[PDB]
């Protein structure tokens, strides 16, 4: 199995405390995060946008793979993942991720493409591991 | 409802194609990713380490909060999230996330702490949204 690691550091309480997040690749190295950026809308990284990025990335790559297996080559795939963090009795929960994608695949049938993209939406590794509602809105250029 | 966004871009097929990943905060901005970095172990970002970073960050924040609710203030929390991407019949799947955390909470009861940290491991938002097995290994300095 493939193992990849992420890390975080936290110090003090939630209001007066702060933290940082990193990844083994180094793309993220002690990047600041906290209550402000996660719940108060202050610009900065947080768990949600990171999961959104991971999801957009896994979905896009999966769409390319499946398209290839169908004998198609995508010119470009641009996916956005909107992660919803809602308030619930237990606190908060990631309830939905809205995927928005613009794909360009030369001469591919609209009906055939839809079948492939819906399979990617529900079949990629990240979608499969998430419990949140996953929606998909796309635009095909062929 | 809080909304956070992530995105990704991909061009060409899976072997000769390539992609990038970004987040709205900018911590990730068109950072390269591909088959190489995700499946061949080449150093670079990928969906798995991003989920790991997100999980480590959520879990550490959640632990601080709960300790606070118990009347405790953590001196420091350092968590690493090890994400497993396994090959399965249908393709691949994120089967497990192993959390390892080092926490310093002066004077807290060992048993008291264990109950709290276990509740955080199972109850934080990111743990809650994941279907993968989540394990916890920690070392408390008290």
Curated annotation (Swiss-Prot), chains A, B:
Question: What does it catalyze?
Answer: a hydroperoxide + [protein]-dithiol = [protein]-disulfide + an alcohol + H2O
Q: According to the UniProt record, which cysteines are disulfide-bonded?
A: none
Annotated GO biological processes are: hyperosmotic response; response to hydroperoxide; response to oxidative stress
Question: What InterPro entries does the entry give?
Answer: KH_dom-like_a/b (IPR015946), OsmC/Ohr_fam (IPR003718), OsmC/Ohrsf (IPR036102), OsmC_Ohr_Peroxiredoxin (IPR052707), Peroxiredoxin_OsmC (IPR019904)
GO MF annotations, alphabetized: peroxidase activity; peroxiredoxin activity; protein homodimerization activity
PANTHER family, per the entry: OSMOTICALLY INDUCIBLE FAMILY PROTEIN
Q: What is this protein called?
A: Peroxiredoxin OsmC
The species this protein belongs to is Escherichia coli (strain K12)
């Amino acid at each position: 199995t493939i193992h990849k690691k992420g890390q975080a550091h936290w110090e003090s309480d939630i209001k007066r405390g702060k933290g940082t997040v990193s990844t083994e690749s180094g793309v993220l190295n002690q990047q600041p995060y906290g209550f402000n950026t996660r719940f108060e809308g202050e610009k900065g990284t947080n768990p949600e946008e990171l999961i959104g990025a991971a999801h957009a990335a896994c979905f896009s790559m999966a769409l390319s793979l499946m398209l290839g297996e169908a004998g198609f080559t995508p010119t470009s795939i641009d996916t956005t993942a909107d992660v919803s963090l809602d308030k619930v009795d237990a606190g908060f929960a990631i309830t939905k991720i809205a995927l928005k994608s613009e794909v360009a695949v030369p001469g591919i049938d609209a009906s055939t493409f839809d079948g492939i993209i819906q399979k990617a939406k529900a079949g990629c590794p990240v979608s499969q591991v998430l419990k949140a509602e996953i929606t998909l809105d796309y635009q095909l250029k062929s």
